[PDB]
Structures are given as C-alpha cells and as structure tokens.
Design an enzyme around this catalytic site. Structure first.
Site, PDB file in Angstrom:
ATOM      1  N   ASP A 137     -11.957  -2.003   5.312  1.00 49.86           N
ATOM      2  CA  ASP A 137     -10.521  -3.102   5.256  1.00 49.86           C
ATOM      3  C   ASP A 137     -10.465  -3.759   6.576  1.00 49.86           C
ATOM      4  OD1 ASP A 137      -8.428  -2.491   2.935  1.00 49.86           O
ATOM      5  OD2 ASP A 137      -7.134  -1.074   4.623  1.00 49.86           O
ATOM      6  N   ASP A 150      -4.979  -1.248  10.468  1.00 49.86           N
ATOM      7  CA  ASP A 150      -4.909  -0.662   9.822  1.00 49.86           C
ATOM      8  C   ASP A 150      -6.045  -0.033   8.385  1.00 49.86           C
ATOM      9  OD1 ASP A 150      -3.003   1.301   7.824  1.00 49.86           O
ATOM     10  OD2 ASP A 150      -3.027  -0.275   6.188  1.00 49.86           O
ATOM     11  N   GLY A 162       0.937  -0.774  -0.114  1.00 53.78           N
ATOM     12  CA  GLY A 162       0.090   0.301   0.125  1.00 53.78           C
ATOM     13  C   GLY A 162       0.394   1.064  -0.289  1.00 53.78           C
ATOM     14  N   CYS A 212     -25.302 -10.012  11.688  1.00 51.07           N
ATOM     15  CA  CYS A 212     -26.287  -8.931  11.507  1.00 51.07           C
ATOM     16  C   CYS A 212     -27.802  -9.320  12.584  1.00 51.07           C
ATOM     17  CB  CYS A 212     -25.495  -8.626  10.709  1.00 51.07           C
ATOM     18  SG  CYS A 212     -24.351  -7.829   9.503  1.00 51.07           S
ATOM     19  N   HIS A 264     -22.041  -6.355   0.413  1.00 50.02           N
ATOM     20  CA  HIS A 264     -22.594  -6.585   1.653  1.00 50.02           C
ATOM     21  C   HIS A 264     -23.969  -7.877   1.984  1.00 50.02           C
ATOM     22  CE1 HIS A 264     -22.429  -6.968   6.110  1.00 50.02           C
ATOM     23  NE2 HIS A 264     -23.434  -6.780   6.002  1.00 50.02           N
ATOM     24  N   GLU A 303       2.254  -2.845  18.546  1.00 54.61           N
ATOM     25  CA  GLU A 303       2.619  -4.060  18.586  1.00 54.61           C
ATOM     26  C   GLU A 303       3.112  -5.210  17.317  1.00 54.61           C
ATOM     27  OE1 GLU A 303       0.168  -5.549  21.024  1.00 54.61           O
ATOM     28  OE2 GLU A 303       1.216  -5.442  23.233  1.00 54.61           O
TER      29      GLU A 303
HETATM   30  N1  ADP Z   1       0.337  -5.588  13.996  1.00 54.56           N
HETATM   31  C1  ADP Z   1       1.506  -5.939  13.123  1.00 54.56           C
HETATM   32  N2  ADP Z   1       1.442  -6.955  12.471  1.00 54.56           N
HETATM   33  C2  ADP Z   1       2.348  -8.058  12.390  1.00 54.56           C
HETATM   34  N3  ADP Z   1       2.508  -7.566  10.882  1.00 54.56           N
HETATM   35  C3  ADP Z   1       1.601  -6.887  10.511  1.00 54.56           C
HETATM   36  C4  ADP Z   1       1.320  -5.950  11.460  1.00 54.56           C
HETATM   37  N4  ADP Z   1       0.656  -4.425  10.667  1.00 54.56           N
HETATM   38  C5  ADP Z   1       1.494  -4.492   9.106  1.00 54.56           C
HETATM   39  N5  ADP Z   1       2.032  -5.442   9.097  1.00 54.56           N
HETATM   40  C6  ADP Z   1       1.840  -6.520   8.016  1.00 54.56           C
HETATM   41  O1  ADP Z   1       3.401  -5.831   7.246  1.00 54.56           O
HETATM   42  C7  ADP Z   1       1.938  -5.452   5.749  1.00 54.56           C
HETATM   43  C8  ADP Z   1       1.914  -3.992   6.183  1.00 54.56           C
HETATM   44  O2  ADP Z   1       0.450  -3.127   6.352  1.00 54.56           O
HETATM   45  P1  ADP Z   1      -0.077  -2.181   6.095  1.00 54.56           P
HETATM   46  O3  ADP Z   1       0.804  -0.870   7.527  1.00 54.56           O
HETATM   47  O4  ADP Z   1      -0.986  -2.092   6.561  1.00 54.56           O
HETATM   48  O5  ADP Z   1      -0.026  -1.208   4.793  1.00 54.56           O
HETATM   49  P2  ADP Z   1       0.020  -1.200   3.521  1.00 54.56           P
HETATM   50  O6  ADP Z   1      -0.587   0.343   3.889  1.00 54.56           O
HETATM   51  O7  ADP Z   1       0.298  -1.682   2.340  1.00 54.56           O
HETATM   52  O8  ADP Z   1      -1.862  -1.866   3.853  1.00 54.56           O
HETATM   53  C9  ADP Z   1       0.834  -6.019   6.121  1.00 54.56           C
HETATM   54  O9  ADP Z   1       0.407  -6.828   5.235  1.00 54.56           O
HETATM   55  C10 ADP Z   1       1.070  -7.097   7.023  1.00 54.56           C
HETATM   56  O10 ADP Z   1       1.564  -8.534   6.424  1.00 54.56           O
HETATM   57 MG    MG Z   2      -2.261  -3.904   4.786  1.00 51.53          MG
HETATM   58 ZN    ZN Z   3     -24.997  -6.829   7.456  1.00 48.73          ZN
END
Ligand code: ADP
Ligand code: MG
Ligand code: ZN
Ligand code: ADP
Ligand code: ZN
Lengths: 276, 280
Positions: free
Chosen positions: B217, B227, B72, B266, B260, B171
């Site tokens: 998401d 995220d 991303g 639900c 959905h 974490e």
């Molecule tokens: N808290 C977490 N614990 C373990 N893995 C994570 C965590 N956050 C992100 N990741 C890993 O690193 C990647 C980065 O995710 P993210 O921050 O959401 O970025 P993006 O904008 O690409 O979705 C994720 O797809 C996941 O595999």
């Molecule tokens: Mg991700």
């Molecule tokens: Zn629903």
C-alpha cells in the site's frame, strides 16, 4: 544486508502495545500583544501604537508578590511565536487588585481591566521615552543610564483575564523615591543619578511632567508613576493607575534634595519661583 | 537654562496618557494537545527505540474545511496550524487529521474495549514509524546509483477537547496523491525511475526482514509516502496481520510474491525473485 536483532526488535516492538500516558500540558498558553514603536532606535521621537496580531507564548508558573495595586507572579517562558517573548527567560505577570478595578469601573464602562492594563503599559513606555531622552542628553560625566523594562499586554483564557508582563529582574529590588516625594539618601553614584532623573524629567518637560516611584534593580526600573504635574485633580493627574496625593508635586519640590548629579546636569532649584 | 523637549517628543509622550486604539484581531483556531512518538536515537532511526511522549504540547489548528477525503477505514480532513508549542507542527501550514469510521471502531471494540479510537491511532502511528525505520535502513544501505529515497511522513497524536476525541495528524502534501501497490498485493507497471524504486522498496522489505515483514500500500505524492500497511507475513491472528488497521485481500503476501515484477532497481539492489522456493 545486515538486519540486526536490535533493528528487528525495535521494528517488532511497534507492532505491539507501547505504553502511552497522556499527561495534560504543563503551564498555560497565553496571547501577547506588543505596544510597537515606529522608531525604536530613536524611542523618544517614535510613535507608540498597539500591535493587532496576538502571538502565543507558553508560560509555566513558578512562584508568588504584592505591592500597592497589583498582584504579581513569577513565570518561565518556555516558548513563544516569533519570539515575542524570549524562551528560557523569567517573567513577572501582573494583574490589578479588586479595589483598583472597582475604582475605575466608572471611568471604563466595559473592559475595565483591559484599559487599566493598556494605560499601565503606556505609562511605563512614557517613562521609557524619557529615560531614552535622558541618556541622549546627559553629560558624559554621568556614567550609569536609567532604563525602564518593556511591558507587554497579555491575555490568558485559563484565567479569562488581561495582564501585564515584563522580564523578571534578578537582584535586590529597591525603591529610590515614591509618589509622595520621599527619597532615599543616596549612598552611591547610581542612586544619585536615579534621584537626579526625577528632577530632570520635571525640568526637561518644562514643569509639565514628573516621574516618581523610581524602583527596580540597579539601573533597570519598572512600575513608575508619570504625573501630569499641572493637573489640579488626581483623577486626571497620572498616566496609568497609580496611588497619588494631590500634594505630590508640591511635596516633591519641597522635599527633593539636589545632589552632585543634579548639579552635573545643571538643574535649577525646584523651590525657585516659577514666573521668575 | 536648559534644553527641554520638542513638539514631536512632547506629542509622543502625552499621547501615551490617552486611550490609544487597540483592535485585537479576532481569535481563530482550535486548541489541541499534541503527543509525539519519540526516538532514542533520531539520527540512527533504524537503531532507535520508540516511546510515546508523556507530557502533551499545546497547539492551535484552524478547521478550514468540511471536506472528508478517502474511502478506506479512515477519513482525512485538511486543517491549518495557527501555532504549535515548540513548533512540533508548523504554523501557517496545512495538515491532515485522520479519524476512523464508527463501524471500524465498533469492529475493534471487541478487541479494544477501552478508548478504541485512541488505541487505533496509537497503532496507526506506530505502523507508519515502522515503515519509516525500514525506509531509513533502505536509504542508508541502498546503492549510490539509486537516485530516489522513499520517505514516510511523520505522524503525531492529537487530542481535540472541542471535538472530544483523538486523531492522527500529519503534514498535508499537495500534488497528485497516487498508489504504487495495494493491500491485495497488486502493483502498477512502473513508467519511471521513481515508481520502479517504490515498487522495489516493497520487495526489499520482504527480503530485508528475512520474510517476516512486507510493506504494501505504498502511496503518496512522489517520494513522500503515507498510510502504508506493514504486514506480519506469517501471523494468522484475526487482527494481528498488519501493524495498523487495514483490510488485506485474499492472501496478499501470496499475491504479491506471485504478481510482483522485478525491475532495474530490484536488480540494482541484488534482490532475488519472489517466485523462487522458500526452502529450496
Ligand atoms: N499526508 C497527506 N497529504 C495529502 N493528502 C492526504 C494525506 N493523507 C491522506 N491524504 C488524502 O486523503 C485520503 C485519506 O487517505 P488515508 O488516510 O490513507 O485513508 P484510507 O483508509 O481511505 O486509504 C487519501 O486518499 C488522500 O487523497
Ligand atoms: Mg488512501
Ligand atoms: Zn523485485
Ligand atoms: N520586573 C520585576 N522584576 C523582579 N521583581 C519585580 C518586578 N516587578 C515587581 N517585582 C516585585 O513584586 C512586587 C510587586 O510589584 P507589582 O506587581 O508591580 O506591584 P505594584 O501594584 O506595587 O506596582 C515588588 O515589590 C517587587 O519586589
Ligand atoms: Zn535635584
């Protein structure tokens, strides 16, 4: 269900700019090392060895202090790893003066300050082992119990130097005797016991060691001078960095005045003949 | 005429007058300043006011990897926490540090002329907190019959002097990191209770905020999510649709209402169908 205005407001607030002011941390983080003991509950029969894993401690400067060879500052410990130091407690951090480092600059090629610190801490531990032995053997008629504070080794990157740290005592700090043998005139039982202690160390170690420079608050002491009474050269006379006169031992034996505590301890006169 | 010391006692004292071995285990870790988004009433998170910490805290992190995960707008790197002042972060624990792609910055530079990165981070963390607050109300009001509780990780603001930049930190979860629904408004077909609950949660937020917000998401490991994209369902402003930076698909809210599928959860939550009419 119920979606209040407060709940909504607090949610929507997160969608906008909330004020943020990065303020650098307060105080300084430092690394602490401990001189460990194989048998704490029996300190006099325990082996001292330096810890390897340095733990972090967060300290904040408060104020200051000056004596003979060191500069001291009072600090507050707000937190530390595995509580190597107690959080919310006051500590005093000490560092050697220029002259002192310049005097041992020859004795210690590299890491002069580090070695000075190590030796200073080891010296206080030696005194500690003696007060421990003392409290174990002293008659029940002797109330008080001398005690030396524990000192820890400290590394500060901020300053990029090594120091010694110990708990800050509260109360009137006083010196009971010094490196030249002078003693105060005991005005109470506690002071007597302190004066008797230095005498006791000498006898207890068969005239091999003498602890002078007894000072602190009440029965809690710090910054002692542990003298190898049989060394004929100052350079090899004291455990850690200390201001000593070669006359020290002779002077102490001449000047010391035995009191009711010395007598309670059944200590012999320091003036007697050593081969009799 | 006395009771002097023993050999062991003498050895232990005399040894202190000599140079004793001191081998300081080498210093590993990167010093960083940790900033937290605080709460007025952490106990009642959904009724609490959020405010950034003022005074930074000290911590040390081990950059044990060069593996930058994700595709991303951000990239995630695992690091280790040696120590953190007051244990805001957990020592001897793995964390994830996230940063955006220069492109993303360049993009927002036309909105955040100054300290773009930091601003984006502030937003990301605020966005996850919004998600946390909704999850708190959700778990607090949801029927007792529901066995699962969605949970968003806490994210902290971190500043690295050595790297000379700001990052968001949280974490590191170990396990299969998956996605239940996405920014296009699409979702998976639930296979179990956990998934049915995650999916119902998104629907619930739309309903709970009376149509103002939608959380999409939903992704993470099991119940623990991270995220998310908190969407202001009605906004039209270029970069003001999502609390935090996220690429929304062609009318994601429209798609979500359209695609959905309500589940046992639900219904357990008594939610109404999204395909119904807004006014009628
Ligand atoms: N808290 C977490 N614990 C373990 N893995 C994570 C965590 N956050 C992100 N990741 C890993 O690193 C990647 C980065 O995710 P993210 O921050 O959401 O970025 P993006 O904008 O690409 O979705 C994720 O797809 C996941 O595999
Ligand atoms: Mg991700
Ligand atoms: Zn629903
Ligand atoms: N542990 C302590 N608690 C409270 N005050 C102390 C402590 N240690 C030293 N001080 C104070 O600071 C002064 C300097 O002590 P210190 O740094 O040890 O110097 P010196 O080089 O003379 O040993 C002392 O006179 C005393 O008043
Ligand atoms: Zn005496």
């Amino acid at each position: 269900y119920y979606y209040s205005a407060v709940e909504r407001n607090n949610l929507m607030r997160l969608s906008q700019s909330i004020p943020f002011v990065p303020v650098p941390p307060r105080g300084e983080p430092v690394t602490v090392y401990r001189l460990e003991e194989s048998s704490p509950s029996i300190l006099n029969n325990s082996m001292s060895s330096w810890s390897q894993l340095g733990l972090c401690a967060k300290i904040e400067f408060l104020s200051k202090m000056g004596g003979g060879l060191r500069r001291a500052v009072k600090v507050l410990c707000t937190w530390s790893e595995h509580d190597i130091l107690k959080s919310g407690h006051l500590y005093i951090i000490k560092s050697f003066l220029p002259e002192v480092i310049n005097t041992w600059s020859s004795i210690y090629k590299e890491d002069t300050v580090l070695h000075l610190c190590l030796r200073e801490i080891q010296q206080q531990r030696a005194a500690q082992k003696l007060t421990f032995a003392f409290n174990q053997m002293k008659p029940k008629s002797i109330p008080y119990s001398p005690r030396f504070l524990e000192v820890f080794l400290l590394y500060c990157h901020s300053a990029g130097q090594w120091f010694a740290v110990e708990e800050c005592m509260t109360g009137e700090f006083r010196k009971y005797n010094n490196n030249n043998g002078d003693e105060i005139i005991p005005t109470n039982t506690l002071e007597e016991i302190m004066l008797a202690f230095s005498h006791w160390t000498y006898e207890y170690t068969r005239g091999e060691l003498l602890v002078l420079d007894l000072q602190g608050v009440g029965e809690n002491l710090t910054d002692p001078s542990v003298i190898k009474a049989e060394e004929k050269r100052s350079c090899d006379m004291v455990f850690g960095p200390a201001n000593l006169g070669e006359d020290a031992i002779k002077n102490f034996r001449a000047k010391h005045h035995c009191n009711s505590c010395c007598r309670k301890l059944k200590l012999p006169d320091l003036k007697r003949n050593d081969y009799t």
